[PDB]
């Protein structure tokens, strides 16, 4: 329901590093506030960067392994993670930015308590 305030600082840092790396503008990313995953190429590569920085990208295929966080996390995220990994961890495309885009698109439709991450990264 509300992401602990302690995740804000690293997410803001993650957001700034990934904007610089992908070349995505804040204007492009803001579309997630309406519950729609941004479709711009730089915005798709921003999503890939986020997952790459938290080391959840299968370094070889581009596959998102949201299960990996279950080791680096102190709170009740198991049921929320296990559902997203059940519904969305099959997504693989020849483009890492496209795989990251399609996976988040699946996350948003699946168990979207949870555009709250768009709020976490994009505006607070
Ligand atoms: C498109 C951008 C701005 C974006 C939108 C939502 C995001 N959500 N990241 C999550 C990662 C793991 C979870 O269990 C839940 C959410 C990440 C990036």
What layout of secondary structure does this protein have?
Elements: H1 8-22, H2 26-29, H3 41-53, H4 78-88, H5 96-110, H6 116-122
Helix pairs in contact: 1-3, 3-5, 4-5
The site of 4-{(E)-[4-(propan-2-yl)phenyl]diazenyl}phenol has 17 residues, from helix 3, helix 4, helix 5 and helix 6.
PDB class: transport protein
Keywords: all helical protein, odorant molecules binding
Assembly: monomeric
By CATH, the superfamily comes out as Pheromone/general odorant binding protein domain
Form type = globular
Radius of gyration: 13 Å
Task: Tell me the span between the first and last alpha carbons.
Answer: 16 Å
CATH architecture: Orthogonal Bundle
Using the coordinates shown, work out and report the CATH topology. Answer: Recoverin, domain 1
Q: What is the number of E strands?
A: 0
Text of the CATH class: Mainly Alpha
Structural class call reads: mainly alpha
Percent of sequence in beta strands: under 5%
The tally of domains stands at 1
Keywords: Secreted, Signal
Subcellular location: Secreted
Protein name: AGAP001556-PA
GO molecular function: odorant binding
